[PDB]
Structures are given as structure tokens and as C-alpha cells.
Design a binder for this molecule. Structure first.
Ligand SMILES: [Mg+2]
Ligand SMILES: [Mg+2]
Ligand SMILES: [Mg+2]
Ligand SMILES: [Mg+2]
Ligand SMILES: [Mg+2]
Ligand SMILES: [Mg+2]
Ligand SMILES: [Mg+2]
Ligand SMILES: [Mg+2]
Ligand SMILES: [Mg+2]
Ligand SMILES: [Mg+2]
Ligand SMILES: [Mg+2]
Ligand SMILES: [Mg+2]
Lengths: 96, 116, 204, 203, 99
RNA sequence: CAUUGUGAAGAGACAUAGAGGGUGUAGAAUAAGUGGGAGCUUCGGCGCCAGUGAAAUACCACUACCUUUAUAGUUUCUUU
RNA sequence: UUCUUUGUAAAGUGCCUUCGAAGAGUCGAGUUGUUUGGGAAUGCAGCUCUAAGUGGGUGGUAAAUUCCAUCUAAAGCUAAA
RNA sequence: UUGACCUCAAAUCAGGUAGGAGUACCCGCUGAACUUAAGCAUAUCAAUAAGCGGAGGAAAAGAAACCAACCGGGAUUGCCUUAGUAACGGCGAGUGAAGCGGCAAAAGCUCAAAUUUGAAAUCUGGUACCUUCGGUGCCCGAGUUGUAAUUUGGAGAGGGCA
């Protein structure tokens, strides 16, 4: 009851898990026949956890000249010097 | 809850409740909701009224037409005794009453100082 | 703002028991401590005339001295060995030029009674020699204050009604904001009485 | 309901009405015994909040305990040890005055079970508490499945084992990183991390 | 508030399609209800003020809200509670003037 | 500090009105002030363009500092 | 396998609207002592002070300001490893 | 005068319950010193031994006022690991956890705070009967200073429609 959903993929995976569980199980009526059904011992082993495939193993090289290291360095720099830049912008704004 | 819903026509509050904080808010609540209240002697009397031992409070919320006029002429005096005197009893501190020997002592000192 | 024009609109004309020069001062209250850093300052911008009786010992003696005659009041040259010790007494403002930079000899024995010494309070060695003469000669205190405060200059003469003392007030009465701290109040020109010699007393 | 008004009014402890009423009740409680049975709870809202129900088998006792520190019971202050243990006066008891109050009440009434306790009054010398007790032999508690868990033998002297609210508070039983020493039991965790775990095939 | 896609920076993390889940009711524990507002106001009228609240009232009247907040922070625990107590005392003062 | 409440007074202190007087020098006066410039006035007294002195002097427009005192709100102590 | 029909009872589910009560000598703060790996103070306890309700607690460097995240204390029960 | 109510008593009153033992393990309180530091006082030994109180077959804890800072997880407990690490420490001697991850086992919930108000619907006890770990009828009593039903924040409640 205490976890929330922020990820549509995880939510859809769990919903698909529930759908296939409801298809795979049979519920006996509360009163009568009890239709003997040859139990299995591990719902976890009948519904294994699958790691999602993230990408395909072969693609085309999409290079456009940013080197992927200048990017990291610039992100670190603007995070480091964010608040100083807003302070400068504020004092420039309240400069009359 | 009846007072909060303004369904009460007349409230009687017993005066000898041993935690007085069970009923100290009831007069102010009745004055705020505009329902008339009366502080009455005897939670035991209210208990015999409602077939209990004590009741500590009672309320008429809807009366029959045979004595609604009696209710009106009664409440016209009850509200004059309590509700209209509420904003002046709210300011007056009771108590501070000395014993018999101390009262005689202080008034003896008074008629000692009354030399003129 | 002090006055859109409220309570001070035409009540300097119907009190004309004295049509003579009616110069009313502006005094109001704010204390400060013992230092002499940032007290009474502030030559402001205020366009009314003063029709004063002042004198200017303006020092420059090229034949523009009688151009200083139409710019100012009197001309002084630097013959200073025995000119003055006890003369300069009736004055609103003074002014000098390119000659009076190194006149220390004529300086402490006479410029100490009223203390008009050329320190950072009295910048008379002036090159700018035609704009701060007829309009700025008006009453505006550039003095040094007491242990508490000095605020006094006339806002208007009796012949000048206050159609201009609605553009003078808050070009002027943002007074000590450009240097001082806010130990003072926010525009502490408050309770005022306009009274030159015959004007009545009105209160906020 | 009036219980909301009472709970809001009980928080105005320095209002003139509550301080006058408190000043009367503290004298009335000094004049009685140190432990005495109250006929009905002084704060019914607080009692029924903590679990009291006005039915047969619920008992309210009132108890006063002496305030202040625990003087170390040693003759003439001589502790016979290193100077770090020479403290006698300003040492503080690790359980609360509320806890020892309800323990003394539980010793007085051993046939009852302590449910909760609550502060009613105090002065410079004493603190005053009202202890809620429940009789685990009355049939109204043997039945009435909402409360018959107290009839279990594991609930004898909950206040002596520190299982009441103030007992768990003073044991430090709370979730969080601030309670890593005392979360499942202080001595339990100490044993758990001072034991030596040796396997058959030594890792 | 969407992520950048890389491992550092201002909004680092993997870009995933969000959901905005349903709001929990326990996130509204401190919300004031009509009944509770009514009860608290009535109890305040019939109970009055405490001694430190009265000295806060006269401190606000005489020596200003800065010293009032200082005394309230010394009396209560925190500066936040001092500010809240001082502003509700200001509202009390305004209501007493309007009364 | 709490236990610890109820009253009277007195002393303050902080707020609120009013009140008076103050050094050398010398102008025209025991001169602590202000920007201004000569006027309202029973005086033509006082100031003015006049002398001169650290300062202009009617005048405060606001008090530079008091307590030497009075009315009411707050609190800090003392006595009972 | 059999008898009683529980039950004009109870429970669940969709949409709209009005609401939505939630624990105080407690939380928190100061100080003292003890304790902790807890370090401008981890927990506990004594004394003093003592709350709020878009609030409160926590976010491992004290404090102010602006945000954000995460739960909902001061009441309680519960097998197995 | 009579009858209540509240509070407090007394009974070899009716019916019950507590003590004490054991204590390996468990929950607390209290609480050292020898020792090590090549001395010794903080420290360490040790939040240990002794002392005291209280339970069960397990106890305790437990369904977040949690961990986190991530694409977030999700009661408690225990094991492997984190880790002899972050940190504490005459920063000396020494001491020293926790989150994540894998696994064992898995289980969730309920009161207070609402007017039943067109009906205290609730319950102990006594007594008669019966199919007796209890049930039905009757009679006192408890209880409105609140026993039942309804709801527990994950929600939920009151109306309206299907
Ligand atoms: Mg003691
Ligand atoms: Mg100890
Ligand atoms: Mg500590
Ligand atoms: Mg438990
Ligand atoms: Mg010893
Ligand atoms: Mg040994
Ligand atoms: Mg040694
Ligand atoms: Mg040795
Ligand atoms: Mg030795
Ligand atoms: Mg032992
Ligand atoms: Mg258990
Ligand atoms: Mg250790």
C-alpha cells in the first residue's frame, strides 16, 4: 500500500504480470467441486524476473562533434557556478 | 452536536460537574450559536429526568404545539438571566471570600481605622 | 510624497499681512551619534529663486571678472596678506576658481569663525563656471551637522506659491538616502509648519 | 463532540481557568494517599484516547512520585572507583517518573494489567499521573475481542518490562538512523555485533 | 523537472515517462478543518492568553517585533515558532483594535 | 528558576504634555544652536544694511544637552 | 455425505457533489548527567521553557533566508524465519 | 420528613486474581573493579560480572513521523556482505555501526477524534431451563462524565444516479 508509481514502464510491466497471473491461475469455488489441479511450488519460478532489453546490439554511428567529455565538464561547471550566476543576475536586476 | 447544528431550542447545564471543564465551554458555545442555556442545580435531577443517575446536561430540541408558548415565556426569562448577562459575568472574578474569623478581623480593623 | 498639494496650496497668499520677503525654513527631527561621517550633506536640485542679499568672493581675475559680474556677485584677487580677518559674515554660498588652490596662509586665521575652509565640505576651486550660479545659489545647506542633526533650508519664498513645491519636494526630500544608513526614518520630513512670518500652523 | 473541545482546552495549561483548577487539584491530590483509586478519569478525552472505555473492568488509579534526580545509594558518597564514577548527585534515572509510577501501581494491583498512563498535575516535589488498568479476569474483557489480547500471559507487567508507551520511549524503540543502538533491543544488538559467527566451512 | 539523460549536472538521471501518481491523504494531516477552526477559536476566546503571550503583546506594542521575536525564541524553541506566534499576536492586536 | 497566590503603598526606569537657565573673547547684552533678512508689535524698544565677536542678536522651523518638576500606559526593585 | 437457509440481512464495485475530525507538560528548545561510531551535541533521563495546523518530524556541520524530497509522532495488536 | 446523587468506607459478603519456584535463552533497571594503555587520571575492560524487577515456548521488535537522493525503494527479525569501513578516540591504546545488494521467512491490521437521536440498539452478575469452554428467558445493576454499529489516513464519510 505504501509504494507509488512514477514509472510507466514498471507500471505496465506489473500490470502485464498481473494479467498473465490471472490467466495462468484458476480459483476454485468456495463451496463445491474443488477441481484438483496439481500444484506447483514457485510462482516466482513460473514468472521469472526479466531484465528489460535496453538497446539493440547493432546501430549506425550518429556522430555530431561534442566529444562527450566537454559535455560532462560543462554540466559540472554550470552546476557548480549556478547559484553565483543567479546572484549576479539578481544584483544586476536590482541595480536600480 | 445539536448545538453546533443549531437544532437545540433550550439547554440545561448541571452545575456540579466534578470536572468542570466538561461544561465550561458550553455557555460560550450556546451564546455563539444563539441557543438559550440555563445553568441548573442538580445533575442528579437531570438524571431522574432522563431515567439515569446523572445526566450533566439536557436539551429540548423540538417541542409540541401545546406548550411551545410555555417554552417561549420560559426562555424569555432564562435568556435574561444568563445570555444577556453573559458579557458582564465574563468579566467578574468570583471567589476571594474570607472566613468568618478573618472577616470579623478585617472589619474590626475597618472600624478601628474609622476614627474621625 | 508629502503633499499632492494638500493643506499647502494657496495658504501663503491670503496670509499676506507681510508681502515682504517671506523665507520659511524646513526643520524636522532625526537624531544620530557622535561621529562626523555622513550627517548634514546634500546640495539638491530645486529650481525656485531665492532673491537673496548674498555675497560671492569669486576668485578669478582675467577680464572675465565682470563676466563673473553677471555670473556671480563680487570678484576677489589673491593679494592676500592683510585683506580680511573679520569680514565674511552675511552669506548663503561661496565660490572660487583656478587661483585659490594653495592659499593656506589666508585660510585658518579667517575661515574658522564660520569655518568655510576648503576641505571636502567646501569645493570652491571650481572650473565649471556658469551653471551653478543663479539657480543653485538658492538656499540649500551644505554644512556640517551638530551632534544630532541640522536640517534647514527654505522650500519657498512667500511670493512663490507651491505649484513648484510639488516638483521640489520629492526631488529634494529624498534627502540623506545617497550616503547615510536608515537609522533615520523613511523620508522623515513629517510634521511641518509653513510660517515665514505670518503663515499659520497646520499639522498632518 | 465535546472531546475535541476538551483536548483543545487541555493544551491551555497556563490559562487562568486551567491554572486555578490545577492549583486546586494538586492540593486535593497531596491530601490523599500517594496511590489511591480515582473513581472516574479526570481527563476522559485523554483516557479514551489512550484506550479507556467506561465499562466494567477498567480502573483508574492516581499516583504521585517524587521529582528530581536519583541520588546514588552509596554511603557518604564514596564510590570506591575511578574518578569518572564518583558522581552521586546529578545522576539521572533512565526510566521516567511516569514509568516508575505505573510500576508501583502495578505492584499495588497485581491482578490488573497496566494499559497506559497520563500526566494530570505536578508541583516542585511531586508529579501526578493517572494510570489506566484493565482487569484480565472480568468477562467483559475475556470477551470483547478488541481488548482480550491483554489476557495473554505475555502481557504481565508490561510496565515492568518497558512495553508501555513511555517504556518503549525510554528504551528508544523507534524506527530510524537515530536509533541504531536501540531499535530491536540495545542488549540484543550488542550481542548480535559482539558475537563471533563461525561456520563449518570458514569464510 | 524532466531529467537531462546524463550522469551529472542539474537534472541528472534517465529520462523516463512520468505518471504523477494519486495524492496520498496522509500528506494533508496538518490541514485545518472547519470544525477544528471553530473549536480552536472558541477555546481561545474562553481561555484568553498566557502570561508570556501577554508580555509579547505589550512588547509588540512598545519595543517592537524584533525584541518580541527574540523573547519568543528564548521562550519557545525555534525562530520559526517565534515568528508564527508573533504574527498571530499581531492579528490578535488588530482584532482587539477593531473590537 | 520553579513550588508561588492575593493587596496596598513607595522608589525608579521607559513612554506622554509642559517648564526654565547656560563663560573666557565683545558687538549692543555671563552668547549653547540653525537656514534666512529686516518687521508683526503698546514701545519705535529690540535686530537689520552699523560696529564686532568662536557664533548673529526679532524669530524658531526644530531642538542641539539637562531634571530642577508636573498628568497618564509599560515594566524593575524595596517595604508592608 | 447429511441437516439447517442463514437473509426482506451483510459486503464489494462505477460516476457527480459537499467534506475529510487524525493523539500536548507532548513535539521542539536550553541546560545537566549518562550513553553512542554520532562528530557545534546518537539516544535516554532530571529541571526550566513550551508550540503549531498548507502544520509537524527527518534529510549525519552550527545559524539565517529560499526551495525541494520523504513520512505523519506523542494510542494499540499481530505468526514465521 | 422522605427519596436520590457524589465521594469514602466496612463485611469469614458472592465470585475471582497476585505472590513463590525455576531462570540456559528473553525484556528492562542498576552497576563495578581487576585488566590494557608497558606509569596513570579521560579512555579501555564494559553500556560487561555481581545486585534487582518481569515473561514465554520463544521473548522482544514489527506494518514507517523509515531508508534514500536513485529510472527510487517499502513492516519486523535473522544470515552473507557492507566492514575492521564512515566515524569516535590523552586522534594514544584502542573502539566502531548503518543504507544499498543476495538469501531465509513472509501477513496484515485497529482504536481516539462524527448525532443512534425515529428510540443504549451495548455489557457483567443473579436466577429458571437447556444440547453447558456456552445458549435462551426474566430480574437487578453498569453505563449518556458515552457502552454498541459505522471509519483509521493505504483512506474514509454524508447525500444523488446507475
Ligand atoms: Mg530522586
Ligand atoms: Mg548507568
Ligand atoms: Mg547527550
Ligand atoms: Mg507488541
Ligand atoms: Mg565501585
Ligand atoms: Mg581478565
Ligand atoms: Mg596500565
Ligand atoms: Mg604492565
Ligand atoms: Mg599500577
Ligand atoms: Mg547479571
Ligand atoms: Mg509478542
Ligand atoms: Mg564500547
Amino acid at each position: 500500500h505504501r509504494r507509488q508509481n512514477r514509472n510507466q514502464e514498471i507500471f505496465d510491466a506489473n500490470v502485464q504480470r498481473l494479467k498473465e497471473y490471472q490467466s495462468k491461475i484458476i480459483v476454485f469455488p468456495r463451496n463445491g467441486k474443488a477441481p484438483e489441479a496439481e500444484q506447483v511450488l514457485s510462482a516466482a519460478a513460473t514468472f521469472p524476473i526479466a531484465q528489460p532489453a535496453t538497446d539493440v546490439e547493432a546501430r549506425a554511428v550518429q556522430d555530431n562533434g561534442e566529444s562527450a567529455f566537454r559535455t560532462l565538464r560543462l554540466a559540472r561547471s554550470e552546476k557548480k557556478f549556478r547559484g553565483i550566476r543567479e546572484k549576479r543576475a539578481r544584483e544586476k536586476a536590482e541595480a536600480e | 452536536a445539536l448545538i453546533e447544528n443549531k437544532k437545540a431550542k433550550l439547554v440545561l447545564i448541571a452545575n456540579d460537574v466534578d470536572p468542570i471543564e466538561l461544561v465550561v465551554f458550553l455557555p460560550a458555545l450556546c451564546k455563539k450559536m444563539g441557543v438559550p442555556y440555563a445553568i441548573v442545580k442538580g445533575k442528579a435531577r437531570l438524571g431522574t429526568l432522563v431515567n439515569q443517575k446523572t445526566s450533566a446536561v439536557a436539551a429540548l430540541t423540538e417541542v409540541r404545539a401545546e406548550d411551545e408558548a410555555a417554552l417561549a415565556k420560559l426562555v424569555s426569562t432564562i435568556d435574561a438571566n444568563f445570555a444577556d448577562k453573559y458579557d458582564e459575568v465574563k468579566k467578574h472574578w468570583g471567589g476571594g471570600i474570607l472566613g468568618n474569623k478573618a472577616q470579623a478581623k478585617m472589619d474590626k480593623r475597618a472600624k478601628n481605622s474609622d476614627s474621625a | 510624497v508629502k503633499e499632492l498639494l494638500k493643506y499647502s496650496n494657496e495658504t501663503k497668499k491670503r496670509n499676506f499681512l507681510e508681502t515682504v520677503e517671506l523665507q520659511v525654513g524646513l526643520k524636522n527631527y532625526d537624531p544620530q551619534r557622535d561621529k562626523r561621517f555622513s550627517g548634514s550633506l546634500k546640495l539638491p536640485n530645486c529650481p525656485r529663486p531665492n532673491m537673496s542679499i548674498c555675497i560671492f568672493g569669486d576668485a578669478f581675475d582675467v577680464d572675465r571678472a565682470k563676466s563673473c559680474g553677471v555670473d556671480a556677485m563680487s570678484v576677489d584677487d589673491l593679494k592676500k596678506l592683510n585683506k580680511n580677518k573679520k569680514l565674511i559674515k552675511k552669506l548663503s554660498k561661496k565660490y572660487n576658481a583656478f587661483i585659490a588652490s594653495e592659499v593656506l596662509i589666508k585660510q585658518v586665521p579667517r575661515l574658522l569663525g564660520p569655518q568655510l575652509s576648503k576641505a571636502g565640505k567646501f569645493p570652491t576651486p571650481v572650473s565649471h563656471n556658469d551653471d551653478l550660479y543663479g539657480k543653485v545659489t538658492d538656499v540649500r545647506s551644505t554644512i556640517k551637522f551638530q551632534l544630532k542633526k541640522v536640517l534647514c533650508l527654505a522650500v519657498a519664498v512667500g511670493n512663490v506659491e507651491m505649484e513648484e513645491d510639488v516638483l521640489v519636494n520629492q526631488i529634494l526630500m529624498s534627502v540623506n538616502f545617497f550616503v547615510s544608513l536608515l537609522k533615520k526614518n523613511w523620508q522623515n520630513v513629517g510634521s511641518l509648519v509653513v510660517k515665514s512670518s505670518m503663515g499659520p500652523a497646520f499639522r498632518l | 463532540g465535546a472531546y475535541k473541545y476538551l483536548e483543545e482546552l487541555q493544551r491551555k495549561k497556563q490559562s487562568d481557568v486551567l491554572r486555578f483548577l490545577q492549583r486546586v487539584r494538586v492540593w486535593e491530590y497531596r491530601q490523599k494517599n500517594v496511590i489511591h483509586r480515582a473513581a472516574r478519569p479526570t481527563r476522559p478525552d485523554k483516557a479514551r484516547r489512550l484506550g479507556y472505555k467506561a465499562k466494567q473492568g477498567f480502573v483508574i488509579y492516581r499516583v504521585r512520585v517524587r521529582r528530581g534526580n536519583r541520588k546514588r545509594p552509596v554511603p557518604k558518597g564514596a564510590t570506591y572507583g575511578k574518578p569518572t564514577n564518583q558522581g552521586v548527585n546529578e545522576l539521572k534515572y533512565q526510566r521516567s517518573l511516569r514509568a516508575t509510577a505505573e510500576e508501583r501501581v502495578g505492584r499495588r494491583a497485581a491482578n490488573l494489567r497496566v494499559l497506559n498512563s497520563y500526566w494530570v498535575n505536578q508541583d516542585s516535589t511531586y508529579k501526578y499521573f493517572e494510570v489506566i488498568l484493565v482487569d484480565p479476569q472480568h468477562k467483559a474483557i475475556r470477551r470483547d475481542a478488541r481488548y482480550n489480547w491483554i489476557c495473554d500471559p505475555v502481557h504481565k507487567h508490561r510496565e515492568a518490562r518497558g512495553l508501555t508507551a513511555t517504556g518503549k520511549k525510554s528504551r528508544g524503540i523507534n524506527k530510524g538512523h537515530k536509533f541504531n543502538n536501540t531499535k530491536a533491543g540495545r542488549r540484543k544488538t550488542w550481542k548480535r555485533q559482539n558475537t563471533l559467527s563461525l561456520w563449518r566451512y570458514r569464510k | 523537472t524532466v531529467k537531462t539523460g546524463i550522469a551529472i549536472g542539474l537534472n541528472k538521471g534517465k529520462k523516463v515517462t512520468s505518471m504523477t501518481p494519486a495524492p496520498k491523504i496522509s500528506y494533508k494531516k496538518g490541514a485545518a478543518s472547519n470544525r477544528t477552526k471553530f473549536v480552536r477559536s472558541l477555546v481561545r476566546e474562553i481561555a484568553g492568553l498566557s502570561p508570556y503571550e501577554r508580555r509579547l503583546i505589550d512588547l509588540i506594542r512598545n519595543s517592537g517585533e524584533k525584541r518580541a521575536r527574540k523573547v519568543a525564541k528564548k521562550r519557545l524553541g525555534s525562530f520559526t515558532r517565534a515568528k508564527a506566534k508573533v504574527e498571530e499576536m499581531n492579528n490578535i492586536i488588530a482584532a482587539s483594535r477593531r473590537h
